[PDB]
Amino acid sequence: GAQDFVPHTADLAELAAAAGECRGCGLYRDATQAVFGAGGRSARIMMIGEQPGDKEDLAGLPFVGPAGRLLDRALEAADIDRDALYVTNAVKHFKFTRAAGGKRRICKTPSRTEVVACRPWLIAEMTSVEPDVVVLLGATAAKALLGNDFRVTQHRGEVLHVDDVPGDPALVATVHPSSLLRGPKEERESAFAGLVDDLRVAADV
Ligand SMILES: O=c1cc[nH]c(=O)[nH]1
Ligand code: SF4
Secondary structure (H helix, E strand, O other): OOHHHOOOOOOHHHHHHHHOOOOOOHHHOOOOOOOOOEOOOOOOEEEEEOOOOHHHHHHOOOOOOHHHHHHHHHHHHOOOOHHHEEEEEOOOOOOEEOOOOOOOOEEOOOOHHHHHHHHHHHHHHHHHHOOOEEEEEOHHHHHHHHOOOOOHHHOOOOOEOOOOOOOOOEEEEEOOHHHHOOOOHHHHHHHHHHHHHHHHHHHOO
16 A cells, blocks of 8 residues: 555654655545645644545645534534644545536545555554544544444444554544534534544543
């Protein structure tokens, strides 16, 4: 996968530039650019989404669109400062299609193959940042570190620890913020509160 493209450095700027030249799977072709993680190596909390979406692919930054604004609202309710986080995604190139009459590029799910191909960047990020806790936002991120059979819905609120993860950080798997954007008002509000709960669990680690 991406392993030959990952240089022997923990400097995030060098890692990010190297990711721009990655060909570890096919996703680099149609994306605009790689979207590396944002934040600094002093971060105690790392958060991992699925992939850059439409806005991120062009902004060059993770979580800048509607799922990002909802995450900001949850972080602020959890009194977590986003500037103090390291925020990234399991795959670094936007996988997408267009529908006729659609108003945006639509994200397509990364295959497990692509996730495994890109995981070396995630490993380099964790080795570089040495977070105390990793928040996994959604199924793809959670499976990247916890195994392909892992179910986010069955482990809400739980602090996890697995053996093949750099520095043995605490892991907290939670709902993807994109899932909180749609549905009945009451279901959204209860899901938002659970997101805030899971963020508080990670920060109290
Ligand atoms: O950075 C982003 C934006 C949207 N969705 C994700 O999973 N990550
Ligand atoms: S998605 Fe990841 S592995 Fe695939 S080309 Fe982009 S950076 Fe490399």
